[PDB]
Every structure is written in C-alpha cells, then in structure tokens.
Design an enzyme around this catalytic site. Structure first.
Site, mmCIF file in Angstrom:
data_model
loop_
_atom_site.group_PDB
_atom_site.id
_atom_site.type_symbol
_atom_site.label_atom_id
_atom_site.label_comp_id
_atom_site.label_asym_id
_atom_site.label_seq_id
_atom_site.Cartn_x
_atom_site.Cartn_y
_atom_site.Cartn_z
ATOM 1 N N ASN A 105 -3.840 -0.675 1.072
ATOM 2 C CA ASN A 105 -3.271 0.611 1.396
ATOM 3 C C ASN A 105 -4.384 1.616 1.628
ATOM 4 O O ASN A 105 -4.991 2.097 0.701
ATOM 5 C CB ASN A 105 -2.331 1.088 0.297
ATOM 6 N N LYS A 140 -5.587 4.884 2.466
ATOM 7 C CA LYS A 140 -5.188 6.274 2.388
ATOM 8 C C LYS A 140 -6.100 7.361 3.061
ATOM 9 O O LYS A 140 -7.133 7.830 2.549
ATOM 10 C CB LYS A 140 -4.688 6.556 1.003
ATOM 11 N N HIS A 179 6.551 4.679 -0.074
ATOM 12 C CA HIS A 179 5.374 4.986 -0.877
ATOM 13 C C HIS A 179 5.470 6.351 -1.552
ATOM 14 O O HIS A 179 6.016 7.302 -1.001
ATOM 15 C CB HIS A 179 4.099 4.873 -0.049
ATOM 16 N N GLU A 222 3.599 8.757 -2.000
ATOM 17 C CA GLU A 222 3.201 9.823 -1.152
ATOM 18 C C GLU A 222 4.414 10.354 -0.353
ATOM 19 O O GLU A 222 4.789 11.527 -0.406
ATOM 20 C CB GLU A 222 2.013 9.348 -0.303
ATOM 21 N N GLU A 253 5.231 -0.343 -8.155
ATOM 22 C CA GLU A 253 4.086 0.396 -8.608
ATOM 23 C C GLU A 253 4.536 1.586 -9.449
ATOM 24 O O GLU A 253 5.087 2.515 -8.847
ATOM 25 C CB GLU A 253 3.343 1.022 -7.404
ATOM 26 N N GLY A 276 -3.643 5.325 -8.726
ATOM 27 C CA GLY A 276 -4.882 6.051 -8.546
ATOM 28 C C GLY A 276 -5.280 6.801 -9.793
ATOM 29 O O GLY A 276 -6.187 7.618 -9.767
ATOM 30 N N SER A 288 -3.447 0.809 -9.679
ATOM 31 C CA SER A 288 -4.783 0.660 -10.312
ATOM 32 C C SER A 288 -5.394 -0.785 -10.384
ATOM 33 O O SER A 288 -6.310 -1.077 -11.209
ATOM 34 C CB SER A 288 -5.132 1.662 -11.447
#
Length: 236
Positions: free
Chosen positions: A10, A12, A81, A83, A153, A159, A199
C-alpha cells in the site's frame, strides 16, 4: 489448507524499489500486489515486471473510473481503506457499493475493514467488524466472492507501530471466516483470503503468517523498504 497467500504493498526511489522487486526471486506461490496512487500508476505500470506481481489502484470509484483503470490495464483495486473512511467519510454502505461496482466490472478487490482503538477498548471488535462485512456481503453474490479479498486491519495499528498480537489477528480473522462460512458458504469461506494489515514488518511477519487464519498481508511503511521482501518471504 491455506489459499494462495497475498503480500500487498500500500503505497501512500519507488523505482529503486520496483528494481529490487523486479530482480528478486520468489520461489513459492504467492501473489504480490503493489497498490499505488494515480500519480505513480503509470510509472509502476511500465517498470514493474516480475511475473508474480500485479498493480492495484486505490479509491477509484466511478463507472468511467473503473473502465479506464481496466483499460489502462489495472485489474485489482483497494477499497474501504481507513484513509477513505476517515478523510473521505465513506460509509460501510458506500464502501460496499464500490466493492460491488468493482467486482461487476471484473476487478479483483481488496476490501478493507477494521475497528478503532476506542471500539476495541469497548470490546466492540466483533460487532464492528461483522457489521462492516455484512454491509459488503449484502451487495455480493456467492460467485462474486471469488474476486474479493478482505484485509483486516485494526485502525489503531495502522502506521502507529502497534501490531496486533498474532492472537488478536487470529481471533478476528477467525470470526470473519466463521461468519462467512455460515452466511455465505463453507466453500466460499475456505477459499477466502483474509489478510492482516497494521504495522507489519519483515520482523513480525512470520509469526503472523503462521496463524491458522492469516492469509497474507497489507503493508504500508515496510513496503517502502527492502524488507518488503522479507515480508513476502514469510507468506511461505
């Protein structure tokens, strides 16, 4: 037994990475995926060449959107996602709508789902999770399942440097898998890839992969590092 693992990047210098990948030897059966942003999509499209790798887009919803990506020769898509859900305010219903649109258009899809630090603390992981999926599933057909991959996730692990313990991922993967088994099919469920994302690093990966219900990963940070390989290598 396990279905084909999946190691997905992924996204970003990137080209220095594709170079690596490209020159790497992957001996086992694993499908590698590099999701990129519209900007690097063309770069990545030309440079990437390892026969065990594909490229995927990101929240590219739309009818025309879908069509061009395809035309551009993009067949995989990352939907739902954090985001998306957070910055873009997409709802489960929205997420599902997109997923179903991708699928009908031939995309391979990685539908993401996961619960917040808060929802987790409150012990609401199963509600949340079952809920997200039940929103997608509702729009799918047993057949459609063949194109969908689930990425689990926990939002708080994205992150933050806070991986789930193999037990937390397993537990969650397990409930996801059980709900599918029961509601969709046993056959749908047993062929289903449920990746863990949050992570993952070339260090924790193996221990994660080892769980009964983990079928791969979805990697942000370490997927920008050479250790992404160690990562792919653990899915064996």
């Amino acid at each position: 037994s396990k279905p084909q693992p999946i190691a997905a990047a992924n996204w970003k210098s990137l080209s220095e990475l594709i170079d690596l990948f490209n020159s790497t030897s992957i001996n086992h059966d694993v499908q590698c995926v590099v999701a990129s942003t519209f900007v690097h999509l063309a770069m990545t499209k030309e440079r990437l060449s390892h026969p065990k790798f594909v490229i995927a887009a990101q929240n590219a919803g739309n009818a025309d959107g879908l069509a061009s990506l395809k035309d551009f020769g993009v067949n995989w898509i990352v939907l739902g996602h954090s985001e998306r859900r957070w910055y873009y305010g997409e709802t489960n219903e929205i997420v599902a709508d997109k997923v179903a649109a991708a699928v009908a258009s031939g995309f391979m899809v990685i539908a993401c789902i996961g619960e917040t630090l808060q929802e987790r603390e409150s012990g609401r992981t199963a509600v949340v999770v079952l809920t997200q999926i039940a929103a997608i599933a509702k729009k799918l057909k047993k057949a459609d399942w063949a194109k969908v991959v689930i990425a689990y996730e926990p939002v708080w692990a994205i992150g933050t440097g806070k991986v789930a313990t193999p037990q937390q991922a397993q537990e969650a993967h397990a409930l996801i898998r059980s709900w599918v088994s029961s509601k969709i099919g046993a056959d749908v469920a047993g062929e289903l890839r449920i990746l863990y994302g949050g992570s993952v690093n070339g260090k924790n990966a193996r221990t994660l992969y080892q769980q009964r219900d983990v079928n791969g990963f979805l990697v942000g940070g370490a997927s920008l590092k050479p250790e992404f390989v160690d990562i792919i290598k653990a899915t064996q």
